[PDB]
Amino acid sequence: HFSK
Amino acid sequence: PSSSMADFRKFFAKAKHIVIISGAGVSAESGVPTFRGAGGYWRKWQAQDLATPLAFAHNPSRVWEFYHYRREVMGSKEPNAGHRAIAECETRLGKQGRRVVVITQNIDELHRKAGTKNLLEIHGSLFKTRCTSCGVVAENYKSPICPALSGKGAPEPGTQDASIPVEKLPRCEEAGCGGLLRPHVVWFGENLDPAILEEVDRELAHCDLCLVVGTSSVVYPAAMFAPQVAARGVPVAEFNTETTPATNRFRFHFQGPCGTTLPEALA
Ligand SMILES: *Nc1ccc2c(C)cc(=O)oc2c1
Ligand SMILES: [Zn+2]
Asked: Which positions does UniProt annotate for substrate binding (chain B)?
């Protein structure tokens, strides 16, 4: 949920 | 950063090992939905809601519906002039003994569909599966990937969950496995494949020209790769739609749709  | 196409072309004419970092803009120019950023939703969710291990753990049917939709959408999408300029570059330079490699965060394979062979897909592919039990990675272009997903994944708000039982989601077909498949796509909170990263590092260590296309060199992923190249004194040329050259330290910045600038730059 946002962080790659 | 220089705007001179003629000056870029001089570097291009001499370059024996081009790295091309391809970001989301190249896919957006083909109309591929990314479900990220403003307005980009599937039902009531964005990718950050669904492309996560926890989402898959809690609702694998919903996550597979999402990826099923994105797989099927590709039947109506085509590579754009940017993909084609990049593939045609690889082909022409390859006959000259010169290397072109495309490092992409895109998972839709339009670079492959355009004819690119030297492709590093750092976020994986919509058209590969990975078995959550045995780890095998397989190509999979089946429409639909399993019978239970036929007609599912509709994107409209209000669409109810299909709530497919896990036994009827895509299963591993290795003899004696039967495990639940996931998309072979990097999710949020997940590691990149270290073997892919090793290959990326090798290309960046050896290239003599680096293009950043459809994204900015100061954000992920290009920010992980371009500084290594600039540190060696290798020219970096950016091709994106930002009227702001978000960087200096990079030699070139060409504003516009990649499908407008790259056919000229890579001719
Ligand atoms: N999301 C993610 C996870 C791991 C990464 C490594 C180890 C390097 C990199 O460049 O980007 C990564 C991104
Ligand atoms: Zn398996």
From this structure: 67, 70
